[PDB]
Write a protein that binds this ligand. Structure first.
Ligand SMILES: CC1(C)[C@@H](O[C@H]2O[C@H](C(=O)O)[C@@H](O)[C@H](O)[C@H]2O)CC[C@]2(C)[C@H]3C(=O)C=C4[C@@H]5C[C@@](C)(C(=O)O)CC[C@]5(C)CC[C@@]4(C)[C@]3(C)CC[C@@H]12
Lengths: 583, 582
């Protein structure tokens, strides 16, 4: 269902706060959810739990953890229908109402919920336990594999992606109410004919006794159009288009109306009128060529892990405007819905990506004992959920299906082939892409032709022709010449960068140094501007972020242009100079 | 005497190395130079001793220390005269040969020596003890005062300058030989008539029996002119000039010649043909206007303190060339002589400066109980020794008499007046300056008219309390207007910058961030470029350096554009942008 909001017809209670917290264990208490949890530990919920507690055992935990609290359903909600919703449980969430399992969800970055109307009476209190599991298998979306250290028996988690496997309730939890007859879903699609804007809409509602009205209201509160029925086409004269760098949002009120013209349900959906098209080598937004500038990001801050944070969100966006970035990519998982809403209002463009990173063991990655058909089922599910959630965001301009898959290997094409089609079939308003790793050159990649736009991640300066910038220039150039001569598509660079410790400086060519970072980004730009087919450049990464432990990671990933606490490295000023002095 | 060298007639022995080291104490060994020091400590000799031992007592020590080692005079110096020289002992040095005092010297940054010819015989070993004192008084030229912490009894050294009071033998020590008849000094003075270069020379030699010859050899080895006599004028047709862009150096060989045609003594002095001139607000090198770019520096590196270091010197000059900096000032004491030679070869320009910093207690600074005429003598003495040693360097383009005196107070003009006259008199070929502090505004200062070029130190602190850039800008411009209306002289900004920790970053305007330092330098430049009379900009400082302890000092002074270990802050790149262009 739609992201819940408070209306004249719907109530919404935040369940964020401190919750009682416990790890699972091998105790005579298998089944925590059946009674009041016994812990002195409280974990705040919009948070990953790993770094909260300054305890190694919680942090390194593999398997289930339990959050618990008492909740009271408002007495004035009799005659209504109500649900508990998790915006996200990373990676596998279960919801329990007093000992009853009521939901079981498997991906780590999308919503789920349970209708508890008939299980708990209005004005009743109940014990809400949400179990969350972090275990990654070859069938989970980021895939991974649990192993056991030989000498100690410590359970340990392997995976093939960078960012740390933060787990828990990294996004908000909610109790909300909906009327018996309610709106369940809305799809809006937006074209333009000359200066007239056209909204294709479809409303899905629980019942049909009494009907659907729609109103489109501009930023001034003026109703600009109306329509009747659960689906149709709304004409808007002299539309205020939604543009990169100049958002405009209309406000689409779907109501349910009874036999009298009395309102039964209402829901307010923000929509931007905008078109995306790929014509040969150009990426077009409202029939105007567009060039991405900005970053791959991560949901990651000093203590709350992947926990959504309003201050860092508003600030991060403020830093984007400051340096003239116009976009970012939801690198390696869908971000919080509230970030997409904020991008819509800020006029920021978004490459929206599924959690499907780490489909690469470089042993054959696409075989029965690795990424296999059941894995592809999970991947298809992730695509559906993401698209289902973010279909109405004008900011979201393209779906990224995966990140660094081993798209050079036998079996990779048979694995991915259905996936671009599924996305295009669920949402025909946007192009589909994926982010290509260096192994999969223009020669070796065997997947690229099934996508509408090509995204490349490349580290010539850092990882291969190390500190040898001229050597990296030549190989970068060759490569790009290969892609441009082989495909007639837009090419957006989505990773390029270098680990850089703030404060570390050198007059020489010195990796990890602030000067080196600048020298490399600067060179990459020089090469980009030589190629007409480039449609975007997004630096890796916006900010330093935590990764799994490893001798080649200095307390995480330091390829940020800002520090974890958002202080600018020299590179940040270079991009600022570049992106504000060119379109 | 002249900086010693190896010639065909002269031998030179380095005495650098590890020496035995002891602090003074109050036991019956009241005279350590009268016998072998049995201490187990060894201190390296081109170095300050303070951070070397990882020991508090030694670092914080106030008073004398003793260095010691044996030396052997070579067998073949029989017919020869021989000396022990310290390039520098900071601040007060004594040389002992086996229980006998043979030299006592007071300034901390210039050389001294002793003729030991008659005390020790060729082929003899002797015990060399060198006592060095670190105490400052109101009469030492950087002045200070020793005090006692009442609760602990601890002896403590107060002073008014920034940089830490490092002591010891910060510079090399030598045993050397010279014939009985020898050259003792040479003065060269260079000038231009059309395209022909002129060299006035004067040679001072220990005896006048048998004459003096001079040859002037070019960079290709060609003798290009000669002269006879102890003094004269040599003409160099179509001279290649020494320029800031591009050093060219002639090599002048002064000799003493016996009745026959036989060389008895010889000495090789590098000379660059160049003029310096002030005209109105313009500083002219070889008749064309010059704009100083670069730094205030310090002799400061991580362990050895003020000890001279060939590596850091070459690198520091590469970094200057890297950022297109064309000059620096020897803030705030003469630097190693080798730096001045190296500056000559590198084509870099030098404001050469005395130890006279800290003549300011902001109680009346210039008065009989504070900085007085006895102090002025040490100061005159300091000018004398600096000019005598650096007079022949083409890189040295101006003398700086003092840094941050209280030039706004009563007594200040009467104290200073003799000093620039003295400098111009010992060297009439260069202009004289001093670095003026923020208190001495164009109104308040009462000394400035006695100098040829005005050097201002104007940290933004003087102008704004709360690190507000627009406030700083309005006040700097007002002040510079005052100076340009009231004096017809070149103005060089000799201190400007911001304390800055490497790695501290902010998208806001925040002091102590790399961004703030950048923005402040940049705003200062915009202001300087609005004024025709500006002849120069030297940022304070080149690199981070150690200071006395202050809660306002973060393990030293962090105004460096480089870190102590020579890493660039963002400010270095900003300066590189400006100086490599215009
Ligand atoms: C690590 C990834 C998947 C890729 O994405 C990463 O970006 C950042 C990072 O590298 O730290 C982080 O955001 C995070 O860790 C990841 O998202 C970056 C590129 C990547 C490291 C590849 C390379 O950089 C280069 C490789 C070369 C190329 C190869 C095969 C060739 O084509 O000739 C020669 C050998 C080698 C080392 C093979 C591995 C890759 C393709 C590598 C390391 C794979 C992983 C990539």
């Amino acid at each position: 269902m739609l992201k819940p909001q408070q209306t004249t017809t719907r109530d919404l209670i935040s369940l964020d706060g401190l919750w009682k917290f416990a790890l699972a264990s091998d105790d005579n208490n298998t089944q925590p959810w059946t009674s009041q949890l016994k812990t002195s530990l409280e974990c705040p919920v919009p948070a990953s739990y790993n770094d909260i507690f300054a305890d190694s055992k919680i942090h390194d935990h593999v398997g289930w953890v339990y959050y618990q609290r008492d909740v009271i359903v408002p007495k004035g909600w009799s005659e209504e229908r109500y649900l508990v919703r998790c915006e996200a449980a990373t990676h596998h969430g279960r919801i329990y109402v007093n000992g009853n399992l009521v939901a079981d969800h498997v991906g780590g970055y999308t919503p789920f919920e349970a209708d508890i109307t008939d299980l708990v009476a209005a004005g009743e209190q109940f014990r809400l336990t949400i179990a969350v599991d972090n275990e990654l298998t070859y069938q989970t979306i980021p895939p991974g594999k649990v192993e056991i250290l030989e000498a100690t028996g410590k359970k340990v988690q392997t995976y093939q992606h960078d960012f740390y496997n933060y787990a828990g309730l990294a996004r908000s939890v909610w109790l909300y109410s909906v009327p018996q007859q309610h709106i369940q879903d809305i799809t809006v699609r937006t074209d333009v004919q000359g200066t007239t804007g056209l909204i294709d809409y479809n409303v899905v509602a629980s019942t049909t006794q009494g009907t659907i009205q729609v109103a489109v209201i501009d930023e001034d509160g003026t109703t600009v159009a109306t329509s009747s029925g659960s689906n149709g086409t709304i004409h808007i004269p002299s539309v205020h288009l939604w543009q990169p760098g100049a958002a405009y949002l209309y406000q689409l009120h779907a109501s349910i109306i009874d036999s009298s013209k009395k309102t039964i349900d209402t829901y307010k959906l923000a929509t931007g009128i905008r078109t995306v098209k790929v014509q040969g080598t150009q990426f077009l937004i409202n029939d105007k060529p567009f060039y991405f500038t900005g970053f791959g990001k991560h949901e990651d801050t000093n203590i709350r892990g992947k926990g959504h944070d309003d201050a860092y969100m508003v600030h991060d966006f403020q830093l984007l405007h400051w340096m003239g970035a116009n976009s970012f990519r939801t690198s390696h998982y869908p971000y919080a819905e509230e970030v997409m809403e904020y991008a819509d209002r800020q006029g920021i463009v978004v490459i929206d990506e599924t959690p499907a990173v780490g489909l690469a063991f470089s042993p054959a990655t696409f075989s029965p004992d690795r990424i296999n058909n059941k894995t592809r089922e999970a991947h298809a599910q992730a695509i559906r959920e993401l698209i289902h959630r973010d279909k109405n965001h004008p900011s979201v301009v393209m779906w990224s299906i995966a990140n660094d898959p081993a798209s050079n290997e036998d079996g990779a094409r048979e694995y991915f082939a259905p996936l671009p089609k599924l996305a295009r079939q669920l949402d025909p308003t946007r192009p589909v892409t994926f982010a290509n790793v260096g192994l999969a050159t223009y020669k070796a990649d065997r997947i690229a032709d099934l996508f509408d736009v090509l995204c490349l991640n490349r580290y010539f300066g850092w990882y291969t022709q190390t500190a040898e910038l001229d050597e990296a220039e030549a190989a970068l150039e060759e490569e790009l010449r290969g892609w441009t001569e082989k495909y007639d598509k837009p090419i957006v660079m989505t990773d390029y960068g270098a680990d850089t410790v703030a404060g570390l400086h050198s007059v020489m060519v010195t990796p990890w140094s602030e000067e080196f970072q600048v020298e490399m980004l600067d060179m990459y730009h020089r090469v980009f501007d030589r190629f007409e087919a480039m449609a975007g450049e997004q630096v890796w990464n916006f900010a330093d972020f935590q990764t799994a432990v490893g001798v080649s990671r200095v307390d995480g990933n330091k390829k940020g242009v800002f520090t974890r606490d958002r202080k600018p490295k020299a590179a940040a000023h270079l991009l600022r100079k570049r992106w504000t002095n060119l379109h």
